[PDB]
Amino acid sequence: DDYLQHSIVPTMHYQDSLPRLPIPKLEDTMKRYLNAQKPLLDDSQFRRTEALCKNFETGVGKELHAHLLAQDKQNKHTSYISGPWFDMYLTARDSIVLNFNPFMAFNPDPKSEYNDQLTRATNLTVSAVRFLKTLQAGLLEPEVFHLNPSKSDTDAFKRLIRFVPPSLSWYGAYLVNAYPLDMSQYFRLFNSTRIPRPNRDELFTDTKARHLLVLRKGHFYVFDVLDQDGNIVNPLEIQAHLKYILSDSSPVPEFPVAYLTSENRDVWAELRQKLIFDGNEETLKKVDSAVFCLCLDDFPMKDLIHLSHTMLHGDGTNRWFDKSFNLIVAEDGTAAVHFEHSWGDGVAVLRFFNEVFRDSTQTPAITPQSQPAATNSSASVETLSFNLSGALKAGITAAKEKFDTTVKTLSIDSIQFQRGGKEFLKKKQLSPDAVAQLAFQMAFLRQYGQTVATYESCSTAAFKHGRTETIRPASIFTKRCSEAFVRDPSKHSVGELQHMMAECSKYHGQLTKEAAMGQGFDRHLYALRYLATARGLNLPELYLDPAYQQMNHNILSTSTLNSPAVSLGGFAPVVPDGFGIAYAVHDDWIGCNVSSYSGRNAREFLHCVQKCLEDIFDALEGKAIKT
């Protein structure tokens, strides 16, 4: 059939009974905030922040917290954090390009010839539309985190849980140590876009739409991928339509409209309104409502640096940055998902990506020898036409200049540390994630001689309308261990270094477990701030502390994925003097893809990460570290 999964448990079976997202005790949040500040602040600064924390906890913060809890109890259908979190990103006026939108790139199809561009674009597109149908049918398996897959991720369990009413279903999974996740964001994968508006942007969906949007050379094309009965269009007709688009000989437009999606959101909100005034609403609606955006690039990937730039931003002409996601396929079949971050936390995107990689490579719709259907693509494929005023043309020109100037400041590079990975580290009783994070702390100390604000995300999707929480990897323990390796390597025995690493790992594990339970401090403190502002109050003194601003100016911004579908991922720094560190610890190696703007040096950072990983592995092997 046209489905890529056949779940007997309805996709949304657990949604009604997911547990509510906890709100920490204010005393715990203040202690955790201070614990994270300890490595970052000098003694004098820390004493000042400590004093503000004491005043907050006894005064205005106590009152905000009381009100936050009361509000939560009146809004039990949701979480305390989801609204405030959406609001932050939808209100943000900065360009979504670099600041927010990341990418993940697919591994190639393991069969060489299936990486032909037309072939792969067809197969990925068909798999994506199969995913859409499977999700909409309730045939996608529920998202569930298992502690023991052997007992809980079984046909036996699934045959039983399907009979348990959704009001009690979560409890059935809980009984077998499995944790269903929130899936309320998943629908915005398709037929969805972000619309620029004054004050706060809109998330738009039109589930009735049946067409794909394709960008090539900055031109916009639409054609149906679902027929009037809801069935997938013949893959050989889809192939014909993509071949038609690939065969088009029009050069890049004088004023490529896609540039506008990279602008400041107020600038783009105004220009979109002008497009509407100039008669383009119907055309914009076709763009906005398409199942997703497929981007066909006409060049091959030169290397991983070029790949990263291409998938993270491109040249500004051939991505519709506002779309829920852009599926990009280059001339050598290299493919990736670039996605808009405001509509969710990316778990939906990773699920999509994983299922699409599996389906497209294991049961491809077409082969490299498939013959396109003899179809009237000139009728079935509409080339969209925008009516551009002088103001719009000038707007596109200004958007292009801004884009080109910004991209010029961005550097990206990677390493592949070959000495070992998860297997070695687990044998040494360490958390691989903790070791990677330690290496980044150590590298930054080596390079810049400082300990800085560091961000790692953790999912809180085990809870109703759960989002993410911040794990703060820069700890008293990583600071201590980094100082030992970098500044006083001769002062410590290998056993002493090993104990320090074990401590780093334990503490990182503790923070990880806590964050997954909603017991970080970042979201709680943000919610209290948001509440004060929403109620029309002046910002409490806690938040005017330079230390609070520093905690949230994330110089080391990190992110990881663990998936056999993912070749690599990437994102730009979140601050001008930051790094954007995409990493993955594989069984036998460690990968790092790091971005920087002019104010930092990614190449030097990566040389430092390599060296730090060498020293960590040496120390774990009992070797004296190399000076």
Side-chain angles (χ1 to χ4, degrees):
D1 53 32
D2 297 280
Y3 305 108
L4 52 61
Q5 206 151 71
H6 301 82
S7 188
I8 64 173
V9 185
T11 306
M12 303 296 260
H13 196 53
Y14 296 108
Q15 298 306 292
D16 286 356
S17 46
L18 296 165
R20 303 200 70 256
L21 182 65
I23 304 175
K25 291 175 190 170
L26 190 57
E27 69 169 349
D28 291 351
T29 290
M30 257 58 101
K31 287 175 194 161
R32 288 160 173 156
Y33 176 61
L34 288 167
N35 286 345
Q37 289 283 16
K38 194 78 177 300
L40 299 190
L41 303 182
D42 65 45
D43 290 347
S44 182
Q45 291 172 324
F46 183 85
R47 283 188 287 265
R48 179 172 53 148
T49 296
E50 196 169 26
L52 290 173
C53 283
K54 282 186 199 299
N55 296 346
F56 186 75
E57 191 184 344
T58 65
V60 69
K62 192 194 298 181
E63 293 304 318
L64 291 163
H65 179 78
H67 198 93
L68 187 76
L69 282 166
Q71 182 173 80
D72 182 63
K73 292 170 208 310
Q74 294 169 18
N75 295 265
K76 293 173 65 162
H77 62 285
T78 187
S79 68
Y80 79 97
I81 197 55
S82 184
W85 205 246
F86 278 120
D87 201 0
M88 185 161 68
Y89 288 106
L90 292 170
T91 55
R93 299 290 88 186
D94 322 77
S95 176
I96 61 180
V97 186
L98 307 196
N99 296 126
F100 305 111
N101 289 15
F103 78 92
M104 21 180 260
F106 292 104
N107 277 139
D109 188 312
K111 301 177 180 56
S112 296
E113 294 184 337
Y114 281 78
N115 296 287
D116 169 67
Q117 180 178 39
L118 173 62
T119 303
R120 199 159 193 210
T122 303
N123 288 329
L124 287 169
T125 295
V126 172
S127 287
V129 175
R130 286 168 172 159
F131 186 102
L132 178 165
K133 282 174 67 65
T134 306
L135 176 65
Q136 290 181 13
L139 290 171
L140 190 69
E141 288 200 8
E143 205 76 66
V144 178
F145 173 80
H146 302 91
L147 290 173
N148 183 36
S150 312
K151 181 167 181 180
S152 48
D153 194 14
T154 65
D155 285 351
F157 178 75
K158 291 167 191 174
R159 289 181 217 286
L160 288 166
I161 200 74
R162 62 175 302 182
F163 289 99
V164 178
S167 61
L168 295 170
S169 51
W170 182 87
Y171 299 92
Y174 181 65
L175 198 78
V176 298
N177 305 133
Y179 302 95
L181 311 184
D182 189 274
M183 293 178 83
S184 64
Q185 293 169 10
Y186 280 53
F187 79 98
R188 289 204 175 86
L189 273 164
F190 303 108
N191 298 115
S192 294
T193 198
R194 181 175 168 166
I195 298 178
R197 303 278 188 196
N199 307 316
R200 188 160 73 210
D201 287 0
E202 156 188 358
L203 297 178
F204 170 91
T205 302
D206 181 3
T207 198
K208 293 190 303 309
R210 287 186 289 104
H211 65 280
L212 177 64
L213 173 64
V214 182
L215 295 182
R216 183 175 173 258
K217 287 193 188 176
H219 302 278
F220 294 62
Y221 306 87
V222 295
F223 63 84
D224 287 345
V225 291
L226 296 152
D227 69 18
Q228 65 188 9
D229 296 327
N231 291 116
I232 305 191
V233 168
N234 184 339
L236 297 175
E237 294 177 20
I238 292 172
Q239 189 195 11
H241 296 156
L242 296 177
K243 189 176 185 179
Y244 167 89
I245 291 166
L246 289 167
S247 298
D248 190 87
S249 65
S250 293
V252 179
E254 195 180 355
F255 296 102
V257 178
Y259 275 120
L260 296 175
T261 59
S262 69
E263 261 285 5
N264 165 284
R265 305 305 295 183
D266 283 326
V267 172
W268 171 212
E270 186 186 352
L271 290 165
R272 189 184 185 276
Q273 287 191 75
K274 292 181 176 299
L275 283 170
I276 294 289
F277 300 157
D278 290 328
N280 298 286
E281 186 148 24
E282 181 163 9
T283 295
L284 283 168
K285 209 133 166 56
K286 299 173 178 167
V287 169
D288 296 345
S289 59
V291 290
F292 55 93
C293 188
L294 172 68
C295 310
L296 303 172
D297 286 0
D298 295 321
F299 49 88
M301 304 297 92
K302 291 178 282 184
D303 54 32
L304 289 179
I305 293 171
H306 182 219
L307 184 158
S308 293
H309 285 286
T310 298
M311 299 321 186
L312 192 55
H313 55 75
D315 74 357
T317 65
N318 210 227
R319 310 281 181 267
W320 191 257
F321 290 116
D322 291 329
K323 207 83 181 84
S324 61
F325 68 94
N326 287 251
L327 172 65
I328 303 154
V329 188
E331 191 270 329
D332 59 6
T334 305
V337 171
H338 175 286
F339 65 99
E340 198 281 306
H341 222 312
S342 78
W343 62 267
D345 302 307
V347 192
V349 177
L350 183 54
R351 182 62 182 284
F352 167 83
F353 189 97
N354 286 342
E355 298 293 353
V356 166
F357 183 79
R358 180 192 52 76
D359 191 66
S360 65
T361 62
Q362 298 186 4
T363 165
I366 71 159
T367 83
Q369 294 74 46
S370 291
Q371 298 305 300
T375 192
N376 180 9
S377 301
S378 298
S380 293
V381 183
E382 190 198 339
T383 304
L384 308 183
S385 177
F386 289 91
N387 176 35
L388 305 176
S389 69
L392 255 290
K393 293 179 178 175
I396 291 163
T397 294
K400 174 178 183 176
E401 304 334 303
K402 180 184 184 300
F403 183 97
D404 290 345
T405 297
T406 297
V407 161
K408 259 177 145 62
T409 68
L410 184 70
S411 296
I412 313 175
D413 208 339
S414 65
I415 60 171
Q416 297 78 39
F417 178 81
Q418 298 290 340
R419 190 161 157 194
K422 272 154 65 179
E423 191 196 320
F424 176 87
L425 294 172
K426 288 172 186 165
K427 285 179 182 180
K428 301 295 184 184
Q429 306 297 325
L430 293 174
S431 162
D433 192 58
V435 175
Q437 296 284 343
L438 173 57
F440 308 142
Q441 295 299 304
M442 195 183 304
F444 200 89
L445 190 72
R446 185 179 164 79
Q447 185 178 10
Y448 292 112
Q450 297 172 324
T451 304
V452 301
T454 305
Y455 185 107
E456 182 185 2
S457 186
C458 187
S459 179
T460 53
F463 301 98
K464 183 62 177 189
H465 288 184
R467 299 303 304 264
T468 60
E469 179 61 87
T470 307
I471 296 163
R472 290 295 183 175
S475 71
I476 289 159
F477 293 171
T478 61
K479 185 171 185 185
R480 183 178 69 190
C481 193
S482 298
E483 182 77 351
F485 273 82
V486 175
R487 301 220 190 175
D488 24 39
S490 66
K491 296 194 191 167
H492 303 94
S493 60
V494 70
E496 285 164 351
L497 295 180
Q498 288 164 358
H499 178 61
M500 289 184 246
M501 292 186 283
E503 287 289 286
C504 288
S505 180
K506 176 160 63 171
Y507 190 76
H508 193 77
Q510 184 64 32
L511 290 186
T512 299
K513 184 183 167 187
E514 286 169 1
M517 295 295 301
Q519 300 286 334
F521 68 85
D522 280 283
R523 298 296 179 279
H524 189 188
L525 293 181
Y526 170 62
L528 295 176
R529 181 160 68 88
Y530 181 93
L531 177 63
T533 300
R535 293 284 166 281
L537 309 184
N538 285 23
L539 196 60
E541 291 192 350
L542 187 75
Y543 301 108
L544 298 163
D545 187 1
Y548 182 83
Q549 319 319 327
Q550 182 176 68
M551 179 60 78
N552 291 104
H553 190 268
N554 294 290
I555 292 171
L556 295 171
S557 183
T558 74
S559 194
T560 191
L561 296 171
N562 302 297
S563 165
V566 173
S567 55
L568 72 168
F571 60 102
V574 301
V575 293
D577 67 324
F579 290 124
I581 302 165
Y583 69 100
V585 185
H586 295 95
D587 285 345
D588 301 326
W589 63 285
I590 300 170
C592 294
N593 195 29
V594 177
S595 63
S596 66
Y597 293 116
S598 304
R600 297 285 175 193
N601 182 340
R603 188 201 172 192
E604 179 60 26
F605 184 70
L606 289 158
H607 284 296
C608 291
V609 169
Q610 175 71 34
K611 175 55 181 160
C612 290
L613 285 168
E614 293 282 344
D615 291 350
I616 284 163
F617 272 65
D618 280 350
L620 289 172
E621 290 173 6
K623 299 176 163 73
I625 46 167
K626 303 178 185 183
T627 324

